[PDB]
Amino acid sequence: HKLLVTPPKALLKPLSIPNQLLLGPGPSNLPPRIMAAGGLQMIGSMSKDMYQIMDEIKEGIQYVFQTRNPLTLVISGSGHCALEAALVNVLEPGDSFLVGANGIWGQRAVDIGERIGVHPMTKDPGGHYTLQEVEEGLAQHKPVLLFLTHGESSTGVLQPLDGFGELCHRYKCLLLVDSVASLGGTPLYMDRQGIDILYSGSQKALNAPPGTSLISFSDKAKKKMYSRKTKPFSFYLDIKWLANFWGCDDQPRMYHHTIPVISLYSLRESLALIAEQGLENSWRQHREAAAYLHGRLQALGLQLFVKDPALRLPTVTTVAVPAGYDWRDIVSYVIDHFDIEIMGGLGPSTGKVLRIGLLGCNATRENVDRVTEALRAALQHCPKK
Amino acid sequence: HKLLVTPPKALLKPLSIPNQLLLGPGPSNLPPRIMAAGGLQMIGSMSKDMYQIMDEIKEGIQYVFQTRNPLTLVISGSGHCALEAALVNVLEPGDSFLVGANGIWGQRAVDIGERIGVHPMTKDPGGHYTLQEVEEGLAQHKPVLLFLTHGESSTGVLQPLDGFGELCHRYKCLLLVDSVASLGGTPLYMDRQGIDILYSGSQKALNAPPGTSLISFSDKAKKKMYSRKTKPFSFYLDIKWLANFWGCDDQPRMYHHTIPVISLYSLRESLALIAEQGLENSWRQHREAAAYLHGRLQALGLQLFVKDPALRLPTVTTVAVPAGYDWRDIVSYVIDHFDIEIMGGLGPSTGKVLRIGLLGCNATRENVDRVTEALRAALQHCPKK
Ligand SMILES: *Cc1c(COP(=O)(O)O)cnc(C)c1O
């Protein structure tokens, strides 16, 4: 007759969160202004004010992406969810998709592609793709879309994109780019680089809480989407509905799903923040911090996974795991003795490296100092064969 | 040579949000404790502390759902996203899905079902489904899964579920229930009612910000999922990955996607809140407010769309639009002159009704007072043929 479950004891306690300095590939710490944004009251998801904040975020995405694409908006999901929305609306079953698979991300792009109806232009962690090699790929399969990771956060590789725009439009192919870890930390120009679909996450250099993602479509990728004959497998990610709600259409905004309002307040303020600083300074800040961090690490004796500075993702550095060390001890030592988070590999780079992230408000010399003296400490106290 | 887009002027201004009393079908206003949760700093998405908060939320979902299902967790998306995750992992292409389509929600369930590979047991806004009629449906198509809306927020209909558990297990059919608008506001017992998949939203009676959703699978629906031969079209919604991250497996938590950490802090506190109050009181609060509100409205002259109190969703009441009135004026009048939000129809009920929502901390006599004197005012000042 009764209620099977009783109120959980743990919930009857107060929520208590540790203070951790997030210096890994994401999420990153939140500036005071973003936290304040997080604690505001709620407004109607379809109110005139919500739309206004929505338009500002759009102008915000056009600026950080550097595009004028009308089809620009926020995906109410994390990084993956933006990738998936990209693929599920552009790729129609059996389409030939060439994938720059040199990190867990390309790996993820294949999986999604397979699942929805693919050519694994494979590499090894640490490698990138030459303008040369992609023609070779565009050659055989003449795919309708190519996938490239700008900032490969699982390997630390910064991937060059100048020209590819054309090398793809050449073969009547759409260019899809992942700038989840690169946005705000290295130069990127969607239009001038002829990228067709660009997506990014909110919790990396932008310092917004995780859960939302940014996306933009060129008139080219747009036309393919509005004239496919199949309806994309997903309703939650349907750009036709999505675009209309975000005001990208000629029609009145129609109810699709309830946007994550509080997260939008936060994303808006994080876009305001980089708009006040300016992309060029943010680019200079990250480059400088990444340079400082590289110096210190080599001084500690560790060597950089990515041999060649031009190919090093400023926002995420991949150090090679030291000699007779179990990386796990190092990571544990740092979070245990200094309250600092840093990671190990991910996918192909698993156990081969340590990843140190420098993002937005955390990409400072001060934190490079802290993670250096943390790492050094680990190095002298952690077991060693 | 330059940057095409310049920092948006609007973003250079401070974020300013109006104070609105949200009394429509969602989202709802946030108690002080949830807002505080929203403004906390970030922690690692895979830290031991994040997992602890994750387990508490799980215990939290088992309690509000009233189940012990190990396969219980949060979907990093809104209500739809939980429905979609439900359907995309249970239904395999060409499966026969019987859908209680009596509101925009069944409508949504068909669309998703079609998109992924369906029997529209149609009704009219205001109607519900008799234990009788579903056998008739389970009869013809002998579908592997049935979809039922517990709280139809677009029509105001509270749908009875006692027995259906069996009337479905009878025909070897899985029972899928939508308790996005009913959870916390009317009695629901997942196990005792033999529901197989139950999902709810975070922004309705729970008073958490929108963007996350709750889901639970019975051992039955679980087995079908872990032994389908096709991989679900979605990677972001793959329960195999999802379950593992949420600690429902025998394996170490493996990185899938970055959970919306800040939103989880808030959802945890909103679960703590109802755990302190108790489901039975929350059920009593909403029933009582809905009763008070019904009285007042009929006193104002308006009539209730749903004729029969037993079928009236406490959390969302559907009033019929009055005589020579343009509903739009009424809704505008209320948000314009009293800062209060209430809605009109949605889908099948479009323009036929007004929807007044009573949710969680907003389901009070005080707010019933406010929306009554708001509505009355509208009634005397808005145009009338
Ligand atoms: C972190 C990261 C992702 C994943 O974003 P999520 O929000 O965790 O799904 C995707 N791509 C790149 C390059 C990343 O660094």
Ligand SMILES: *Cc1c(COP(=O)(O)O)cnc(C)c1O
């Ligand atoms: C509001 C509502 C939904 C939609 O939830 P979203 O988070 O806006 O996608 C689904 N079902 C019911 C019964 C609802 O009331």
